[PDB]
């Protein structure tokens, strides 16, 4: 049901695509853009506590942030990492270089893999 879709620090049109696709795939996507690491974590925790899956796009943090990795290690559901362009890992899966479609394809995986 509830899929968190989160972006780290670095749009309106897109948020509708993911939202519409989730509705159409029988999910409910909460798409949120963070402006600081402290709330990125705030939001990963909320997701762990609620046992919710996460589609994450945060580059740079992926390679160094123990806090972020320890937050992600708390999840009871898949963590899919998405990267819009080509150029841890706790990530259950990774999609990179497939454009904005990566977000949608990650929704498609979550829709056929729900527990």
UniProtKB/Swiss-Prot annotation:
Q: Does the keyword Thylakoid apply?
A: no
The intrachain disulfides are none
Picking any one GO biological process from the record gives: chorismate biosynthetic process
The name this protein goes by in its record? 3-dehydroquinate dehydratase
Named in its record, the pathway it takes part in is: Metabolic intermediate biosynthesis; chorismate biosynthesis; chorismate from D-erythrose 4-phosphate and phosphoenolpyruvate: step 3/7
This chain's source organism reads: Mycobacterium tuberculosis (strain CDC 1551 / Oshkosh)
| Residues forming the catalytic site | 83 (proton donor)
Q: Tell me the residue numbers annotated for binding substrate.
A: 57, 63, 70, 84-85
Task: Print the keywords alphabetically.
Answer: Amino-acid biosynthesis, Aromatic amino acid biosynthesis, Lyase
Q: What does this protein do?
A: Catalyzes a trans-dehydration via an enolate intermediate.
As its record notes, the protein acts as a catalyst of: 3-dehydroquinate = 3-dehydroshikimate + H2O
The EC code for this enzyme is 4.2.1.10
Q: Which PANTHER family match?
A: CATABOLIC 3-DEHYDROQUINASE
Q: Does the keyword Lyase apply?
A: yes
Q: Which domain of life is it from?
A: Bacteria
């Amino acid at each position: 049901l509830i899929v968190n879709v989160i972006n780290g620090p670095s749009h309106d049109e897109l948020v509708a695509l993911i939202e519409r696709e989730a509705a159409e795939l029988g999910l409910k996507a909460v798409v949120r853009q963070s402006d600081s690491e402290a709330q990125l974590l705030d939001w990963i925790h909320q997701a762990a506590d609620a046992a919710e899956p996460v589609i994450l796009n945060a580059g740079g943090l992926t390679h160094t942030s123990v806090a972020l990795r320890d937050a992600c290690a708390e999840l009871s559901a898949p963590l899919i990492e998405v990267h819009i362009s080509n150029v841890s890992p706790i990530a259950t899966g990774v999609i990179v270089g497939l454009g904005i479609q990566g977000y949608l394809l990650a929704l498609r995986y979550l829709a056929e893999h729900l527990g």
